[PDB]
Structures are given as structure tokens and as C-alpha cells.
RNA sequence: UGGAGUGUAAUGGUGUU
RNA sequence: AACACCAUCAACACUCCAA
């Protein structure tokens, strides 16, 4: 449970399709770079970079480095130092800096690591290279999180009010098969427009000009302007000095008063306008507008609008209106070719091969994106049943149930209707029409509604939920489903899930109000999928004969994900397959320490599933496929250490000396890796993304370890995010082709739609279970997520 | 709450007049 | 009570499901 497995082979299945990734090939010298520790007493990163810059130029006689922003420093060539601390002093129109030698980061070892010589890739080297590549834009651009942003060169994309659209990019140095690469992905966000506050007022209050009004209109405009400007920074323009607006004056600049404290003699009552007239010899062109209160309320510092400008680099947090969000998505999340050309454009205007800090270390980055071969895997046949037992073939990652019926359809004979929407806006005609339509779609799907509901009543208040269901359960012998019509976002849903999933173990299905009023066959169809799954039936199965050889022996599939609160316990969810299709899953959910991604009680959970598996299959799993979702790279060593043992432990304490092969895989949807079609004809749909099933396990993947990219879904909008799979462990010794095909095939067992999803069904289900347990003093709440006896044996989370 | 896709700080710590 | 720094994968919105 210590070392991750090396990549066994390279996949050869599927048709090859020429691709380009957003990785940029880097040329790195064999020189050793020198690392030094800094000690600065007592400061923000920008201040540190500035201080280091001064220290660089002011100590050139004694001693062109790159800087981390925090105590960490690197140089290309060595300098006059020793292990001894060398402390000095600098001055900013006042700091003490201590430079100490640390280490010699050899890039020869990096070439040896990328090559077959050394198995391990030195992390310190990756850190160093990243610091080098980031030192310039950390000062040149506006850093946000792990990205760098900036304004627009020519045109200015506006949003209205004081906002505008700033574009940016996220860079990170990554290792590859033979050559270090620079991963870069563009992004965009909303900053505050660098304009005079007078114009900020104009734009916020919908003024064509400031001279449209000469007297303030109302307190409400003061509140609106305050709501927009309170917290922002502004710079002054009659001296330079940057200030932070704390409030807005009620009174005009001509009447807003303050204690003048004119040297000795203390205070005299003076108005702001009069102050600017006397002190700064400035008559207010617009004395009638109120003032910005800056600094401390006790300090009484006020400023007229015509001397304040809003400083740039201020990102917005305020809510965005319809036009703002529209213009945002109408200028970002563009099609794949557009994003591609934007990244190319970015690599053109950033110009890394000309920057001095980059040139200092003799690094060369390719101005063209990385060409990668790639291959599109083959979609599995989906077997439907009914009288015809028709087959559905996924085309472009999507299929349909046209002239097809469920592999195992359930004849629904007893069901109920409980509408929580007001009858005023939800008539009985709506309910009856919805019932007819639903019955038709149901009978067509292979899950026939054999007759009218045995119950149909309006209601109100969450408090009506718990009593009623009991009554409903005791009156009608053998009811199968309870349908709950909801009027939109409501805590009622949460109570319906509480009573339904935990208390009685009754199959419940909520439907939003509007979908009862206006009904489309698609909605009713997917809804029927959900119903048929919730009642223990089987929508569709993978073609039995068309499966990887892993299915030749009893194998269980596990999915795991963790969800964290907005102080409250986090929750980890682990699901497991219960047949050999594999269509049916059972869910286990636990509560945990705050924001602890490492699943603590995993072992126990696994045990349950394993036990349940046997109970459902009368077979003991010879193999365990564990899809862990939600963990990033920096956690792997930790997670792989505990959870794998937790899995293994669960296999030992259960029966004898039973140790099946565990295949620990990590799913990742959150990463900065993009893929584009080289051939224009290979583009798919309006978004022009790569075809569903696109697999890449070369060039841009890990040099030694077992990882691969898989885009298993069709891009509906924007640019697809290819799901990343990193095999942290493999006892079954899978081949690349077999495991990739297995994954892509498990991406088709999602029962909520007739489409291929981005991540495998177990992981998705785990996410759904976790997010479901979210709606449901620590040991008290620990029993709140424990679902019902009968609910356990179902897929309620769907 | 029919479904899929993709766009965008909180805490504990040290410290401050 | 504000303000600095170091360690740490939920909401909202849009697109698509006529010819």
C-alpha cells in the first residue's frame, strides 16, 4: 500500500484521431540551479517580490534571481555565500532580510528522471521550474488563486456598472514522457473598471452623464452606490495615495462637516468643499455630489468624487445581473476551436521566450501546442428488453429508447400523488393530463402504469409529510411509489427525502410544478428511468458478450466521493455494484471530520457492500475495482496509504484469508488539460469538441506511472473537460486497453439518462449519495444519514 | 425538484494601533 | 473589530434534449 504501479503498456484499441493539447514543450538545460532560503522579519507576497527586487539591484556590487514571494529563492548561477546566514538591511520609501544557502537543484537528474534512468521525478525540481516560469507574471500580471489575469489590449469588454471582463491564464510546469512541458489554460473573470468614481456613479446609476442631475435624487441612490462601492479601493488625484472607501456621506460636499484640527487650537467645524477650496486651492466642479468616507469613522476622512479614481486590479464579488452574466458567458466558455485559438493567441502575447527571468535560466518554450496522437475507443452495445429485446447503439455518446423497452420493466399497479403546490396555480386538469402523458410514456418504456393512482391530494407545509406517508402506507396494500409535486426550491423536498429514504423505506419521486403543467415526452421518459430504477428494476445492461475479460470472474465495482459543508461534519459516500451487469448499486454513507477528504470508516463501509454483494450474487468478488473521486494529486500518498488498507482490511476481517485484487483508480474532472481536433472534419457538434470516447495515454501523461485521459461524453456547450484517471494501485494487473475500455463501458451504465457520462457510473452515484445525505451533537447527526432497511436495497439516490 | 454538459472565499493558526 | 501572513475540491448561471 506504498508505491503506485508503473504503466504496463500503451493502448492500441480504437481509431486514432490527430489531436493537440494545451501543453507546450519546454527545452531545459543540464545546468544545476542554486536554492537559497530567505528570512524576512516580520508581509504580502507583492511586497516581498518588491523587496527582493530592491535587494537585487542594491547589492549588485557584492552579489538575476527568481522569487517565490515567500522566504524561498532561486538563482541560475552561484553567488558569494556559504551555509552561514548572511543578513542585511533594505529600505522602502524598511526591512531586514536574511539570505541562507539551501541546496543544489540538478536538472541533469531531471533529464535522468524523464528518461528511463531514474524512476522518481524530483518534486523540488518541478517546484523550482514553476517558480521560474511564474516569477515574471507574478509581478507583471494580476495573480488570482493559481492563475494570472489582465485587462484587454484593444477593445474593452464591459459588464455595466463599474465592472468589466478581464482575461487570464493558469500556468503550471508538468512532467512528461521524455520532455518537460508547460500546461497552460485560459480563463476569464470580472474586475472593476479603472475609471473616475464620478463615472462609476454615472455607470451604476444609469446616467448618460454626471451633468444630467445637479441635486441628488434620493437616499435609495445613496444606498445603491454604497452597496456597489463599500469596500472598494480608490486612488486620489491631486498630489497617488491609495485609500479604502468605508462609507458614503449623506450630505453633499458643500455641507458635509468635520473637525478640522488646524494645528494648535484643536478643532474647528469645516465643510469638505470649503476644505478643498482652501487647502488644495481646488473648487469643486460638482460640489453637489456626496463624498466617500475613507479610513476610520472616528478619523472622519471624506473625499469628493471628482478627485477619486477607482484603482484597477479589483475583482468583483457582488451579484451579477442578467446582462452581466450573459455577456460573461457570451465572451467565455466559447467553442473548442475558439478556446484553442485563444490559448494560441495567449502564448503569442505572453511571449515567454523573450522574458528576461525566463531567458536567464536558458529555457525555451514551444509557441505551438503539443501534438498528440490519441485514439477514440469503441462504444458498448446497450441491451434493452421487452417483447422485442432491442439493442441501442451509442452514437456520438448518445442513444435513445426509440422502439425499445427496459431490460426489466416493472408493471406499476399501485401508486400515489401528493401535490405540495397551491391548487390555485396547479389545477386538477394539470394533474390528470400529466397522469395520462406519464402513463403513455411509461407503457411505451416497458414500465406500464396499469391504472389510475389510488391516492391524489393537495397539501402544504413540511409538517404534513411525516404523518401522511404512514397513513398512505397503512391504507393501501403494497403501494410501490409516492410522487411528490413541488412548487420549486423548498425544504419540503428535504423532508420528503427524510421521511422517504430513512423512516418508512417507501420509494418516493419528486417532480417540479412546471413539468406537471407543461409536459414534454423527453422529461417524462427520463423520469420513467428514475422511477424504474427506484423500484428495483433494470433499465438497461451492458451487452454480456461484449465485455472485457475481467467479467469472466466475479468482480465488484466501488465508487467513492466526499462532500464538505459551506462548521458541520463532512460526509463520505461509497457505493457498490450488486450484479454482474453491472446495473444495480447499493449505497453506504458516513459522517466525518470537517473537510477531511480521507474516508475514515471506509473499511466498515466496504465490508457492508461486500457482504451485500454476496447476498445479491451468491458469489465472492475475486476482483475489486475502486473508483475514488474527489482527491487531488497532493493527497494521493495519504489516501492510497489509508483507504487501500481500509479496503484490504475490510477484506481480511470479513472471511478467512480472502484477499481479492484491488484496483485503486482516481477520477479527476478538475484539471487544466484541454484537447482539440487537428482535423477540422473531426470536430463534433456546434462546440466542435472531440468525439465521446477520446482516449490519450501518451506524451502529455505521467512519465512512469499509470494514468490516462478519457473524454467519455459529448460536449454540449463550450469545451469538454476530459476526465483524468490515475491508477494508484492495481493487483489484477490490468492492461491499458482492458481498463480503459472497462471504464468507458462503465460510463454507459448510468441509469438516469440514455447518454454517456463524463465519469464512470460508480463515482457519479457516489457523488449523488453524498449530495443526497447533505439534505438529511455529532453522534446524534451520525444516525441521520442511516437510510431505511428497505431503502438500503434500492437506488434511492438516483 | 426530467437529464446531461460547462462557465464563475470558509476555517484554524500565528501577529498587529 | 478590523487588518496582514502560513497550511488547507458548496451555490448560481447558461447551452442542448423546432425543421
A519 and A559 in a common domain? no
A396 C-beta less than 7 Å away from strand B = no
Q: How far is the CA of A389 from the C1' of C10 (A)?
A: 43
| Nucleotide B2, nearest residue via CA and C1' | A523
Judged by C1' against the alpha carbon of A629, the nearest nucleotide is C9
**Based on C-alpha coordinates, what's the Rg of chain A?**
32
3-state class of A511 per DSSP?
A: strand
Which domain CATH number covers A697?
3.30.420.10
Q: How far is the CA of A774 from the C1' of B8 (A)?
A: 23
Q: How far is the CA of A44 from the C1' of C4 (A)?
A: 7
Structural domain tally of chain A? 4
Q: How far is the CA of A44 from the C1' of B16 (A)?
A: 14
Q: How far is the CA of A326 from the C1' of C13 (A)?
A: 9
CB A378 within 8 A of CB A13: yes
Backbone phi, psi, residue A8, to 5°: -65, -50
Query: Resolution of this PDB entry, in A?
Result: 3.8
A746 and A649 in a common domain? yes
**Cα(A695)–Cα(A712) distance, integer angstroms:** 8
**Cα(A369)–Cα(A344) distance, integer angstroms:** 7
Judged by C1' against the alpha carbon of A516, the nearest nucleotide is B2
End-to-end CA distance of chain A: 33
The residues, ordered by sequence, that sit 6+ positions from A9 with a Cβ below 8 Å of its Cβ are: A735, A736, A737
Residue ending a domain, among A527, A545, A563, is A545
The residues, ordered by sequence, that sit 6+ positions from A57 with a Cβ below 8 Å of its Cβ are: none
CB A488 within 8 A of CB A422: no
| Nucleotide C9, nearest residue via CA and C1' | A630
A307 and A431 in a common domain? no
| Nucleotide B7, nearest residue via CA and C1' | A333
Grid cell for residue A732: 489484477
A716 C-beta less than 7 Å away from strand B = yes
A562 C-beta less than 7 Å away from strand C = yes
DSSP output for A720-770? --PEEEEE---SS---HHHHHHHHHHHTT--TTSSB--SS-HHHHHHHHHH
Backbone discontinuities in chain A, residue before each (C to N > 2.5 A): 42, 63, 93, 239, 566, 776
The residues, ordered by sequence, that sit 6+ positions from A60 with a Cβ below 8 Å of its Cβ are: none
Count of alpha carbons within 13 angstroms of residue A229, beta-carbon side: 34
Instruction: Tell me the residue range of the domain where A714 lies.
Output: 546-798
| Nucleotide B10, nearest residue via CA and C1' | A566
CB A593 within 8 A of CB A524: no
CA distances for A322 relative to A137, A207, A222, A226, angstroms: 33, 19, 23, 21
The torsion angle over the Cα atoms of residues A647, A653, A657 and A661, rounded to 10 degrees, is -10
Helix (H) or strand (E) holding A197: helix A197-204
CB A287 within 8 A of CB A253: yes
Q: Where are the alpha helices (DSSP H) in A463-520?
A: 465-475, 491-497, 514-517
Listed residue (A551, A541, A542, A543) closest to A734, CA to CA:
A551
3-state class of A641 per DSSP?
A: helix
Q: What angle do CA A663, A723, A583 make, to 5 degrees?
A: 60
**Cα(A489)–Cα(A502) distance, integer angstroms:** 21
Residue ending a domain, among A270, A296, A315, is A315
DSSP state of A412: B
A247 and A167 in a common domain? no
Q: How far is the CA of A792 from the C1' of C9 (A)?
A: 28
Q: Where on the phi/psi map is residue A215: left (φ > 0), alpha (ψ -120 to 50), or beta? A: beta
3-state class of A528 per DSSP?
A: helix
**Cα(A357)–Cα(A68) distance, integer angstroms:** 13
A768 and A699 in a common domain? yes
**Cα(A304)–Cα(A145) distance, integer angstroms:** 34
Residue ending a domain, among A288, A315, A342, is A315
The torsion angle over the Cα atoms of residues A745, A748, A749 and A752, rounded to 10 degrees, is 170
Kindly tell me the sign of the dihedral angle through the C-alpha atoms of A410, A412, A414, A415: positive
CA distances for A44 relative to A47, A83, A170, A657, angstroms: 5, 27, 21, 57
Grid cell for residue A468: 401522511
Q: How far is the CA of A49 from the C1' of C4 (A)?
A: 16
**Cα(A224)–Cα(A275) distance, integer angstroms:** 27
CB A142 within 8 A of CB A148: yes
**Cα(A715)–Cα(A616) distance, integer angstroms:** 37
Listed residue (A365, A280, A361) closest to A32, CA to CA:
A361
Judged by C1' against the alpha carbon of A716, the nearest nucleotide is B5
Judged by C1' against the alpha carbon of A48, the nearest nucleotide is C5
Judged by C1' against the alpha carbon of A325, the nearest nucleotide is C13
**Cα(A442)–Cα(A370) distance, integer angstroms:** 49
Return the axis-axis angle of helices A521-534 and A428-445, rounded to nearest 10°: 70
**Cα(A283)–Cα(A281) distance, integer angstroms:** 7
DSSP output for A124-187? HHHHHHHHHHHHTHHHHSEEETTEEEE--SSS--EEETTEEEEEEEEEEEE--SSS-EEEEEEE
**Cα(A738)–Cα(A741) distance, integer angstroms:** 5
Q: Which nucleotides of C are covered by protein (CB under 7 A)?
A: 4-10, 12-17
Backbone phi, psi, residue A389, to 5°: 55, 50
Q: How far is the CA of A717 from the C1' of C13 (A)?
A: 13
**Cα(A774)–Cα(A432) distance, integer angstroms:** 33
A719 C-beta less than 7 Å away from strand B = yes
Q: How far is the CA of A144 from the C1' of C1 (A)?
A: 27
Which domain CATH number covers A507?
3.40.50.2300
| Nucleotide B11, nearest residue via CA and C1' | A567
Backbone phi, psi, residue A516, to 5°: -95, -30
A69 C-beta less than 7 Å away from strand C = yes
Helix (H) or strand (E) holding A615: helix A602-617
A151 and A290 in a common domain? no
A204 and A175 in a common domain? no
E strand residue ranges, A550-592: 555-563, 570-577, 585-592
CB A569 within 8 A of CB A778: yes
The order of strands in the sheet holding A242-252 is: A301-304, A290-294, A242-252, A233-236, A308-310
A597 C-beta less than 7 Å away from strand C = yes
The answer to whether the peptide bond before residue A42 is cis (omega within 30 degrees of 0) is yes
Listed residue (A677, A549, A554) closest to A620, CA to CA:
A554
A672 C-beta less than 7 Å away from strand B = no
Which domain CATH number covers A261?
2.170.260.10
Kindly tell me the sign of the dihedral angle through the C-alpha atoms of A81, A83, A89, A93: positive
The answer to whether the peptide bond before residue A582 is cis (omega within 30 degrees of 0) is yes
DSSP output for A295-307? S-TTT-EEEEGGG
| Nucleotide B1, nearest residue via CA and C1' | A512
| Nucleotide B5, nearest residue via CA and C1' | A716
Q: Helix count (H) and strand count (E) of chain A?
A: 21, 39
The residues, ordered by sequence, that sit 6+ positions from A373 with a Cβ below 8 Å of its Cβ are: A16, A18, A19, A698, A699
Q: How far is the CA of A455 from the C1' of B13 (A)?
A: 58
A745 and A701 in a common domain? yes
A406 and A343 in a common domain? no
Q: How far is the CA of A709 from the C1' of B11 (A)?
A: 34
Judged by C1' against the alpha carbon of A44, the nearest nucleotide is C5
A213 and A91 in a common domain? no
Q: Which nucleotides of B are covered by protein (CB under 7 A)?
A: 1-9, 11-12, 15
A297 and A337 in a common domain? no
The residues, ordered by sequence, that sit 6+ positions from A372 with a Cβ below 8 Å of its Cβ are: A19, A20, A21, A675, A696, A698, A699, A700
Exp. method:
X-ray
**Cα(A617)–Cα(A113) distance, integer angstroms:** 46
Kindly tell me the sign of the dihedral angle through the C-alpha atoms of A275, A276, A279, A281: negative
Interface residues 561-580 of A with strand B (CB < 7 Å) = 567
Listed residue (A199, A188, A196, A216) closest to A161, CA to CA:
A199
Q: How far is the CA of A326 from the C1' of C14 (A)?
A: 8
| Nucleotide B8, nearest residue via CA and C1' | A189
Q: How far is the CA of A563 from the C1' of C9 (A)?
A: 9
A432 and A365 in a common domain? no
Q: How far is the CA of A162 from the C1' of C2 (A)?
A: 26
Grid cell for residue A266: 484643536
Backbone phi, psi, residue A293, to 5°: -85, 120
Listed residue (A684, A742, A733, A679) closest to A706, CA to CA:
A733
CB A299 within 8 A of CB A650: no
Judged by C1' against the alpha carbon of A494, the nearest nucleotide is B1
Amino acid at each position: 500500500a506504498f508505491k503506485p504501479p508503473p504503466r504496463p503498456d500503451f493502448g492500441t484499441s480504437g481509431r486514432t484521431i490527430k489531436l493537440q493539447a494545451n501543453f507546450f514543450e519546454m527545452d531545459i538545460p543540464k545546468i544545476d540551479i542554486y536554492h537559497y532560503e530567505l528570512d524576512i522579519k516580520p508581509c504580502p507576497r507583492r511586497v516581498n517580490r518588491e523587496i527582493v527586487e530592491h535587494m537585487v539591484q542594491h547589492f549588485k556590487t557584492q552579489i538575476k534571481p527568481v522569487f517565490d514571494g515567500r522566504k524561498n529563492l532561486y538563482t541560475a548561477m552561484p553567488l558569494p555565500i556559504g551555509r552561514d546566514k548572511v543578513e542585511l538591511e533594505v529600505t522602502l520609501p524598511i526591512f531586514k532580510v536574511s539570505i541562507k544557502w539551501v541546496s543544489c537543484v540538478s536538472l541533469q537528474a531531471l533529464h535522468d528522471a524523464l528518461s528511463g534512468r531514474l524512476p522518481s521525478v524530483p518534486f523540488e525540481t518541478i517546484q523550482a521550474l514553476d517558480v521560474v516560469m511564474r516569477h515574471l507574471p507574478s509581478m507583471r500580471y494580476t495573480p488570482v488563486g493559481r492563475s494570472f489575469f489582465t485587462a484587454s489590449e484593444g477593445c474593452s469588454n464591459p459588464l455595466g456598472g463599474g465592472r468589466e471582463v478581464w482575461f487570464g491564464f493558469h500556468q503550471s510546469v508538468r512532467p512528461s514522457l521524455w520532455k518537460m512541458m508547460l500546461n497552460i489554460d485560459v480563463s476569464a473573470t470580472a474586475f472593476y473598471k479603472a475609471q473616475p468614481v464620478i463615472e462609476f456613479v454615472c455607470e451604476v446609476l444609469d446616467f448618460k452623464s454626471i451633468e444630467e442631475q445637479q441635486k441628488p435624487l434620493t437616499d435609495s441612490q445613496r444606498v445603491k452606490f454604497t452597496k456597489e462601492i463599500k469596500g472598494l479601493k480608490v486612488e486620489i488625484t491631486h498630489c497617488k495615495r491609495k485609500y479604502r472607501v468605508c462609507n458614503v456621506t449623506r450630505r453633499p460636499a458643500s455641507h458635509q462637516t468635520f473637525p478640522l484640527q488646524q494645528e494648535s487650537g484643536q478643532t474647528v467645524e469645516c465643510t469638505v468643499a470649503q476644505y478643498f477650496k482652501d487647502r488644495h486651492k481646488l473648487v469643486l466642479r460638482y460640489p453637489h455630489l456626496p463624498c466617500l468616507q475613507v479610513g476610520q469613522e472616528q478619523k472622519h476622512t471624506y473625499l469628493p468624487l471628482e478627485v477619486c479614481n477607482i484603482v484597477a486590479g479589483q475583482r468583483c464579488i457582488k451579484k451579477l445581473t442578467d446582462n452581466q452574466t450573459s455577456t460573461m458567458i457570451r465572451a467565455t466558455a466559447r467553442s473548442a476551436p475558439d478556446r484553442q485559438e485563444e490559448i494560441s493567441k495567449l502564448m503569442r502575447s505572453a511571449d515567454f521566450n523573450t522574458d528576461p527571468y525566463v531567458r536567464e535560466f536558458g529555457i525555451m518554450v514551444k509557441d505551438e501546442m503539443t501534438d498528440v496522437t490519441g485514439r477514440v475507443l469503441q462504444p458498448p452495445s446497450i441491451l434493452y428488453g421487452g417483447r422485442n429485446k432491442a439493442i441501442a447503439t451509442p452514437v456520438q455518446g448518445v442513444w435513445d429508447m426509440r422502439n425499445k423497452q427496459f431490460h426489466t420493466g416493472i408493471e406499476i399497479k399501485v401508486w400515489a400523488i401528493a401535490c405540495f403546490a397551491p391548487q390555485r396555480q396547479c389545477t386538477e386538469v394539470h394533474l390528470k393530463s400529466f397522469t395520462e402523458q406519464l402513463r403513455k410514456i411509461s407503457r411505451d418504456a416497458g414500465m406500464p402504469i396499469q391504472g389510475q393512482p389510488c391516492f391524489c391530494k393537495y397539501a402544504q407545509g413540511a409538517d404534513s409529510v411525516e404523518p401522511m406517508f404512514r397513513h398512505l402506507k397503512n391504507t393501501y396494500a403494497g403501494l410501490q411509489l409516492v410522487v411528490v409535486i413541488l412548487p420549486g426550491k423548498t425544504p419540503v423536498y428535504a423532508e420528503v427525502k427524510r421521511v422517504g429514504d430513512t423512516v418508512l423505506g417507501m420509494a418516493t419521486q419528486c417532480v417540479q410544478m412546471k413539468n406537471v403543467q407543461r409536459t414534454t415526452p423527453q422529461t417524462l421518459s427520463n423520469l420513467c428511468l428514475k422511477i424504474n430504477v427506484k423500484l428495483g428494476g433494470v433499465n438497461n445492461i451492458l451487452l454480456p458478450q461484449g465485455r472485457p475479460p475481467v467479467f469472466q470472474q466475479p468482480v465488484i465495482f466501488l465508487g467513492a466521493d466526499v462532500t464538505h459543508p459551506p462548521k458541520k461534519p463532512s460526509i463520505a459516500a461509497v457505493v457498490g455494484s450488486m450484479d454482474a451487469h453491472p446495473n444495480r448499486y447499493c449505497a453506504t454513507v458516513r459522517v466525518q471530520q470537517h473537510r477531511q477528504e480521507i474516508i475514515q470508516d471506509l473499511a466498515a463501509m466496504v465490508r457492508e457492500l461486500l457482504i451485500q454483494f454476496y447476498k445479491s450474487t451468491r458469489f465472492k468478488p475475486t476482483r475489486i475495482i475502486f473508483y475514488r473521486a474527489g482527491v487531488s494529486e497532493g493527497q494521493f500518498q495519504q489516501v492510497l496509504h489509508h483507504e487501500l488498507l481500509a479496503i484490504r482490511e475490510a477484506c481480511i476481517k470479513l472471511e478467512k484469508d480472502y484477499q481479492p485484487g484491488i484496483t485503486f483508480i482516481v477520477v479527476q474532472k478538475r484539471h487544466h488539460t484541454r484537447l482539440f481536433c487537428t482535423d477540422k472534419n473531426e470536430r463534433v457538434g456546434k462546440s466542435g469538441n472531440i468525439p465521446a470516447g477520446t482516449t490519450v495515454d501518451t506524451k502529455i501523461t505521467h512519465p512512469t506511472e499509470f494514468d490516462f485521459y478519457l473524454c467519455s461524453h459529448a460536449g454540449i456547450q463550450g469545451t469538454s473537460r476530459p476526465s483524468h484517471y490515475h491508477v494508484l494501485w492495481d493487483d489484477n494487473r490490468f492492461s491499458s486497453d482492458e481498463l480503459q475500455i472497462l471504464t468507458y463501458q462503465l460510463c454507459h451504465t448510468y441509469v438516469r439518462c440514455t447518454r454517456s457520462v463524463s465519469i464512470p457510473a460508480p463515482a457519479y452515484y457516489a457523488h449523488l449519495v453524498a449530495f443526497r445525505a447533505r439534505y438529511h451533537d455529532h453522534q446524534a447527526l451520525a444516525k441521520a444519514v442511516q437510510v431505511h432497511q428497505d431503502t438500503l436495497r434500492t437506488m434511492y439516490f438516483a
